[PDB]
Every structure is written in structure tokens, then in C-alpha cells.
Amino acid sequence: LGQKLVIWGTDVNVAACKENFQRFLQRFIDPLTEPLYMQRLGEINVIGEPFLNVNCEHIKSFDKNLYRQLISYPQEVIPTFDMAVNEIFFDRYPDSILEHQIQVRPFNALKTKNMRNLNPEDIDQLITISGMVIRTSQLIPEMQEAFFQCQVCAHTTRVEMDRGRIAEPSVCGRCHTTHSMALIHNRSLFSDKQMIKLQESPEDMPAGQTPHTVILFAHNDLVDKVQPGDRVNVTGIYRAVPIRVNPRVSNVKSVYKTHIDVIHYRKTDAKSEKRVELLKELSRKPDIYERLASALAPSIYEHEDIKKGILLQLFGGTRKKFRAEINILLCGDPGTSKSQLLQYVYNLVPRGQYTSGKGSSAVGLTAYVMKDPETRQLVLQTGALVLSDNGICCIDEFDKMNESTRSVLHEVMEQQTLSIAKAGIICQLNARTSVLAAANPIESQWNPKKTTIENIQLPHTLLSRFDLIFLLLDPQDEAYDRRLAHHLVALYYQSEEQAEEELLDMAVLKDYIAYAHSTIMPRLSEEASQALIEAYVDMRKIGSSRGMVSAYPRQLESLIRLAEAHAKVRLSNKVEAIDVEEAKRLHREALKQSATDPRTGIVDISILTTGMSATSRKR
């Protein structure tokens, strides 16, 4: 009987606790009006989730003693609260159906302890701690009901798990043969379980100390909700269990291993027609192209055409070998704005990636095969170019990638695939990634006596695959320096209003790009076709002088990509002469910056081969 039940050696009455929690559910209307948690139990009826999250601050404000009993004795109290919630969910809404009994999930919003100060006095208390997940194990199947069958006579029985053990039948009731009941593993019933290793956050550490870690266990319906690298305030019971000295011996070490029996996660670092009509109205705004290009990278100064090219890359061409991915190269001295621009723009798009061209990159450009450490089996770890299969890949310090990386990147940029024949695996992974690059000069400074390919020492076989190449060196003008200094002073005086304006611009920019990807598919108009043919023929007519080649058809395909991207920027859905002229302008400016021989200006052969005519005529 409920009224006779009392927590063991505790004098807390279970029925009183249940009724007090029901009173909390009934009366708590005031988080700052129906009760908040009865509103949530109205929502759960249609949402269908099997849990009710509740705030321990709310419980404490309603009743100090109930909160204290929850914190002190969660192992008994939380099942009591579950029974209370499942009674209320059929007192109200009595005709409802739900596949599982509701699980209450108490939590304090902030940490009650930090993991360095956990003590044995905290054992079996409800606590919550802040941390970062280091590793997350495979889904462990944990038994909850053992199904036994008689080997002789096929009689079956079911027995509950007591405290992890099984009360094996020892004799079959329907034929009385001893030791004849056999556990049928796949007829038994299992719940989900997973181990999570949690490290304290870096700011919480003492000065120069290595991290402490704690083990978490998350069970059914709360199992796979966290990933490595994320941050969480995790609420659970601080358990202490014995560990056996040897797997074949039941002696246990005197020192108990501890872990967190997880009850609630709260991720702390992860974060419509109105949106559609706002974006549609914004697409008709005058100079929307310049508006979006200026919204790109507010911290960076004056680089208009670079931002415009990055915008056209982020919008991309029309998908349908018909590669629509626009390739962009940034080129300039170390310490300049290109690295900051890459580190900004990679998080501005879904499916994006950022990596270094050097061997210290966390995720390499090439796919490889490794032994997964937690299980020591082979796993095909694909590279960043493959993980960014429909997004931008930001390759910083592009220039100094080794020859194998150069070859596989050439393969990716030309074929939009990455072939691997490593360890018996033979497969051709898709990589429709938009390569955005940042390349330094080989020496410490840019050399105006030399063109881009000779300064950066990259092959023409890679440089000719890029749609646009831009120079990020700064002028030596005192007006430029003074304007840059005023801009940097404004960045120093950046305040909350500028931050909110920049974040509003960032949000609408992300939404605009995603919507344009989702719905816009530009297609050629007749004037677009005539303009593109005219552009290619005109830029080929320059070759009448000196008998040189001044263009090649991949330039035309690049212009098609850029025009389609510009049409997608303004949500036209049909590409026409306005887009084609902007594509021509930006493309010609990129060639003017990149393909300029110092002796004669722009010359197209610099991209086709290294060593332009003014250099090669030494021999």
C-alpha cells in the first residue's frame, strides 16, 4: 500500500511525496494562466514524446522540502514523480494513449558542482555538472526481461532482471527436467544504453591543470542525444559501483568506480511564410547584390569584388559532366585578411568545412583508412573534400600542400569525385564541393616582379581549374591606411547594437542563401546565350594581336557558372544579360588581378602555362 511505503532508513513517505509532486503540478502557474507543466502535459498528448522536463528551481521555489528530497533521494523519488505524472496524465485527458509511461526529467539550469569537487558524500545524490563530451560509445543493448525456453518440451517463460542478475528457472514447470531451460537471447527484451566520457570545460579548469573526466551512462530514449566535441550541462545520479579484480573472480576492488546515471541533457553551445515573404521582398531591393556582398564579412575592409565572388560561390550555379561548383582562390601575404575571411565564411553555410593544407590539419583532404581506437576495426575516414560534398571547403595555407594532396585535389576539382583503393576497399566517393582557397607567396612578401603562379609555386593544372583568382594585398596608399585604421578603430569600438545588427544580417544572409538553394533553378534565356557567345568570341578576338591565345572554352563555362549564380542571387530563375554582364565584369577583374604579367599587363597564357612570354623569351 502506498501510505505504508517509506524510503529506506529515510523517513520520507512515498505517498506524501507523490501527492506533493501532484500539488506542484497542479499549482505551479508562475515560472516568472494554466500550470506550466500541465500545459506541457497537454502538449505531450499531440507531440508524443515519452518525457516531461521539469526545472529543479521551480520545484525549490514551490517547496524547499520537496526539492531537498528530490536531490537527496532521486533513486526512489524520481520513480515516485514518474508515477505521479502518469497518474495526472490519466486524471487529465483520461482517454489518451501513449506507447510508454512518462519519464520525468528534473534538472537545475546551472551546475550545482564541478567535477573536481565531487566527493563520496555526493554518492546517490542528484547532481548536475558542466562538461564537454570526449567520446561516445556504441549503442549497448542492455537486457530488461530474460526469455527462457525448455530444450526438451518447448515450454517458455519470462523473468525480470532483479539488479542486473537473472533468476534462472533451474527446472521446467511443464516437464520437470532440471537444467533444461535455456536463455533465448533474441527473444529476450533489451533497452538502449550508451557510455559517454565527459571532460570539464576549459574555462572551469584550474591554472595549467590537465582535465578531469567522468563517465556517463544514458539509457533508453535519452541514448544518442550528444556527440563528441559538444558542450552540455548534464543532470544525473552520482553512482558508485564495485569493479571486479579479474573477469573470472567475484572479488571486487575496495576503491569504487563512479559514473553519472544521466537523467537530463541540456546543450549549452549549439545555438516560415514570414521568412519567405521577407526574403522575396528583399530580393526586389535595389542593389541587393551589393547589399549581400557587403553583408559578407563585416570585419573585413574594402574587398568588394572578393566578397562578390564569395557570394556567387555560396549561391553556386545550376546543378546540371556539368559541374556547377564555383572555385575561388584568394592570394596574398601571410597575416592578411584572407585567413580571417575563410574562418568566417566556412560556418556561414550548411555542409561547410575548414581545413589546413599542411599536415597538422585535423581533417585531411585525402580519404584514408584507420583502426577505430575504441573497437580496433577498420573505418574509412573520408577527407574534408568528401565531407563537404554539397558545401564549401575552405582550404587555408593552400600553397604548401604536398604533391599527393595536390594530385587528389586536382582529381576532386576536375572530376568531382575522390577514388580510393587503400586496403581492399575500392570505391569512388562523390565530392561536389566548392573549393575556396587561400594561398601565400613562397617568400614572406608578394613580389610584383613575378606573376601569381611563379610566386605561389602551384601548378597550372590546379590554377586553371579555379573560376576566379583574387589578390588580397593592400595598397601602400596613406589614404588606404588611414581608412583601414579608422575601420579598425570602429571594430574596436564595436558594441551591442552593432553586434545585433551584424547578427541580424548574418541570419537573413544564411536564410536567403538556403532558400535560394532550395527553390531557385536558373535557366538560359536567348539574350543570355547570345551574350555568352559574344563574350567568348570577343575575349578570343584579343588573340588577333601577337598571334596569341587570349581565352579558352573553360572560361566560357566559368562565365556560365557565374551568370547562373548571379541570377540565383536575385531569385530571377532565368539568367539574362544583367547577370551575364556582371559575370563578365567580375571574371575580367579577376583575370586582371591574377593573370597580369608585370611587363605587358593581363595575358591569358599565364593561367594556361607557367612562364609567360616575357619570361620564356629568355631562351
Binding site: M132, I134, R135, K197, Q199, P202, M205, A207, G208, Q209, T210, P211, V245, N246, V249, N251, D333, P334, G335, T336, K358, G359, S360, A362, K371, P373, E374, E397, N440, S444, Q445, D474, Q476, E478, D481, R482, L484, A485, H486, L488, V489, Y492, Y493
Partner: protein
Amino acid sequence: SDQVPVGNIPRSITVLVEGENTRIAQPGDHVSVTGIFLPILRTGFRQVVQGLLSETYLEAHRIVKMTREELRQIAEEDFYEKLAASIAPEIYGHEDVKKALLLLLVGGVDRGNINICLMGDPGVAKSQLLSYIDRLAPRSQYTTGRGSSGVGLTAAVLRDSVSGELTLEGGALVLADQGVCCIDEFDKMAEADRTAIHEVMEQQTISIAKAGILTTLNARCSILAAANPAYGRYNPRRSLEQNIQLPAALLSRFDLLWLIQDRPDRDNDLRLAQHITYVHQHSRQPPSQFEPLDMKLMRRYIAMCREKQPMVPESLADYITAAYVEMRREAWASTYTSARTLLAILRLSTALARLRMVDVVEKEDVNEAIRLMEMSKDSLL
């Protein structure tokens, strides 16, 4: 280490700590432990294997660990130069370098670390200067860029095979976390070390693997770098990156670049020789016609100084703009100046505002930053 016999590895003892004796100790700490020396009585298979022998542990019972007049002395307006003089009286000259080192210990407004680098030939008193900063600073480390058989600049994972439980430990950058890390022969670093320092300069944390899995490990230390020429004595006809043989992506990170060049000078050589001979003859520095300030008092001073939080006004921002553009004219006419230069002079001016112990910068701060950068370039030239 200084108590081990001559030809022997240092011995170790397991200490088991219970109750309120726990959490008294930390790694790297010097302690004296009163306890009971006892044998570990293992069970089962280990008993027949070990026989009458037994491992031992120490059952710990006790663990023990081994101003307004002064503020008026600090109030004397000499205090800036008084401190600069107190910094390493064993080294003559380079007084502006000593001022820069003081601002390194102070730090700017919170970024904030004044990373600096001072190149020179071997034996130029460069190592002696770095050793002084390591001794003075409250949290610090001193290491070689090369190749050490110890734990590297990054932390490392030890095994402790009697238990077999792998654990992270050390790392010069990690041990120096809140303070300053001094690196000798920075030029001779491996590429892994160069990338680690690059990561520290970028985001002030490093990545390391324990058992194939990996974590992030925190280190916000200021870097004090000493480097050699690639060959011989420094020649000013060659640029610093080509001479020192370091990439500009790292070498531009340091706020100040100094060249501690050494050349003969008769009277200064004789003064130096008299100093060294007195040090050998009496095991102490000779009297210097002044009293260095107590290092504990210097630590108190820089602590309350670092607790001040300056901010720049708009007029001083305009002054920063004018000084920066003029300095960039000079650099362009003679190129290792960029937006990082403006941020460097802002950092140094806020550092001097902290040194003045006032929550707003002033013209003398920007003047000091400008002249320190200019004369560091002059020392390099």
C-alpha cells in the same frame, strides 16, 4: 633531483591518501609526508608469483607543503625605471628591452598577451635574460625549441605500467598556462612544435591524444622566444626571416622583435668581466650602487597592476590612427607592418596604462608603444 646519488635514477614511492589529507597535493609540488611505510598485500595469483617479496606504499597521515609603505615606494614616479633597473642588474644596457619585458609581464587589455622575440648569437647573454624572466615570473617555463627527450611544448601521455593506466602530463605551454613560456633556440623547433605554437597564437589551446581518442588542452601563455642566426653572427645586410630561417606566419605574431647583437667594446667588456669574476669569487652579484626591488614586492605590484582594466578614449584612438599611418609611411619607405601593428601598439599602450595603474590610457602610453616598436626595429636595423 639534487639529492639523488651521482649515477642513479631518482627513486619513487606510492603514497595512499585518505580523508582530509586528499587534495592537499598537486603534480609538480614539493611536499613532506608523514606516514606509515607498509607493504601492499596483494591477493591470489600475484601472491605465489611474488613470494616473500612485496611492493610498498606510504600511508599518509600528514602532508605539509614546502603593505602601504611599499605602495608608497611604488608611488614614487621613478617606479617604472626603478622596476626596469630591478630587472636583471646582471645585464647592462637594453633598458628599453627591459621595459618591454615588464610590459610582457603586465599584459594588455583582454588577445592581451604581449608575445615578444629577441634574436642573437649564442652566448650573447640572451639565455641569461630569459632565465631571469623565468625566475621572476609567478607561473612560467623555460625550454629549448629543439627536440627535447622530456615532455615537449605540448603535453604527453605516460603509461605507468605497474597499473598500465595512461595519463596526460606536463607540456611546457600547459604548465605555463596563465603566465609566460620561455623558448630557447626557437629557430630549431620541429614543424610539430611550430604548428603547436601557431595554434597557441591563434586560439590558445592545443590538441593531444591519450589512447587514440583526443581532447583539447588549454594554454594561454605568453611566448618569450630566443632564436639564433642560421649560421654564425648576425649580418644586418640580410633580412630577419631569411637570416633566422623562420616562417613569417609565426615570426610576425610577436609584438616586438629585438636583435641582441654582440660586438667588442673595451670598457663594457672589462665591466662584464669584473662582474663575472666577482660572481665566481663570491657566488653573488657585486654591489650595483642601487638596491633591486624585492621580487615578491614586484610580484605584488604587477598583480595589482594586472587587476586594473584600462579603456581607450576616442581622442587617443585618433592619435593612434595618426601615429599608425605615419609609422606605416616609415615602414613602407624602408614590410612587417599591418593591422597587427595597430593592435600591437594598442596592446602596449593598454599595458603601460596598467603599469600606471589607471583605468584609461593617455598620450604617454601611445608614445611609449610607438617608440618601443620603432627602436626595436632600429635594434634590428
